[PDB]
Amino acid sequence: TYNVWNFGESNGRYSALTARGISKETCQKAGYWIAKVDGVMYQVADYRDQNGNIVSQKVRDKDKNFKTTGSHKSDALFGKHLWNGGKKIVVTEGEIDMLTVMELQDCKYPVVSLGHGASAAKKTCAANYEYFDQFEQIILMFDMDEAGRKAVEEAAQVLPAGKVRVAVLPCKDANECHLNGHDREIMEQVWNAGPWIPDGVVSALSLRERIREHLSSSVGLLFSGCTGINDKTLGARGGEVIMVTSGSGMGKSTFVRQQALQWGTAMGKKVGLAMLQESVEETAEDLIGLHNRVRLRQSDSLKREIIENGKFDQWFDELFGNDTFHLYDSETDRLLAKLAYMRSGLGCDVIILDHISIVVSASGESDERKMIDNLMTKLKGFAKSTGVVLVVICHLKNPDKGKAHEEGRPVSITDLRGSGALRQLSDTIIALERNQMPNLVLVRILKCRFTGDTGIAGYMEYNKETGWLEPSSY
What is the footprint of a second copy within residues 114-173 (CB under 8 A)?
A: 157, 161-162
Whole-angstrom distance, CA of residue 133 vs CA of residue 164: 12
Write the interaction track for a second copy spanning residues 355-374; mark x where CB under 8 A is met and - where it is not.
--xx-xx-----------xx
| Smallest separation, CB 254 to a second copy (Å) | 9
Q: Is 211 in the site for a second copy (CB under 8 A)?
A: yes
Residue 191 or 450 with smaller CB distance to ligand TTP: 450
Report the interface residues with ligand TTP, using CB under 6 A: 246, 248-254, 277, 424, 434, 438-439, 441, 449-452, 462
Q: Is 406 in the site for a second copy (CB under 8 A)?
A: yes
Residue 114 or 396 with smaller CB distance to ligand TTP: 396
Write the interaction track for a second copy spanning residues 188-207; mark x where CB under 8 A is met and - where it is not.
--------x-xxxxxxxx-x
Residue 26 or 419 with smaller CB distance to ligand TTP: 419
Residue 114 or 274 with smaller CB distance to a second copy: 274
**Angstrom distances, CA of residue 286 to CA of 104, 256, 339:** 74, 13, 23
Write the interaction track for Mg ion spanning residues 1-20; mark x where CB under 5 A is met and - where it is not.
--------------------
Whole-angstrom distance, CA of residue 472 vs CA of residue 468: 12
What order of strands is seen across the sheet that includes strand 455-462? 325-326, 271-274, 350-353, 389-393, 241-245, 428-433, 440-448, 455-462, 469-471
| Smallest separation, CB 305 to ligand TTP (Å) | 21
Enumerate the known binding-site residues: 93, 143, 173, 246-253
Annotate 92-120 with b (16+ C-beta within 10 A) or e (fewer).
bbbbbbbbbbbbbeeeebbbbbbbebbee
Instruction: Find which of a second copy, ligand TTP, Mg ion, none residue 80 binds, CB within 5 to 8 Å per kind.
Output: none
227 Cβ neighbours under 8 A, 6+ residues apart: 458, 471
* Cβ atoms of residues 58 and 45 within 8 Å: yes
**Angstrom distances, CA of residue 28 to CA of 12, 24, 80:** 12, 6, 15
Total residues in contact with a second copy, by rule CB under 8 A: 104
Residue 364 or 452 with smaller CB distance to ligand TTP: 452
Q: Is 57 in the site for Mg ion (CB under 5 A)?
A: no
Instruction: Find which of Mg ion, a second copy, ligand TTP, none residue 446 binds, CB within 5 to 8 Å per kind.
Output: a second copy
Residue 94 C-alpha from the chain's centroid: 30
Q: Are strands 241-245 and 428-433 parallel, antiparallel or unpaired?
A: parallel
Whole-angstrom distance, CA of residue 474 vs CA of residue 455: 17
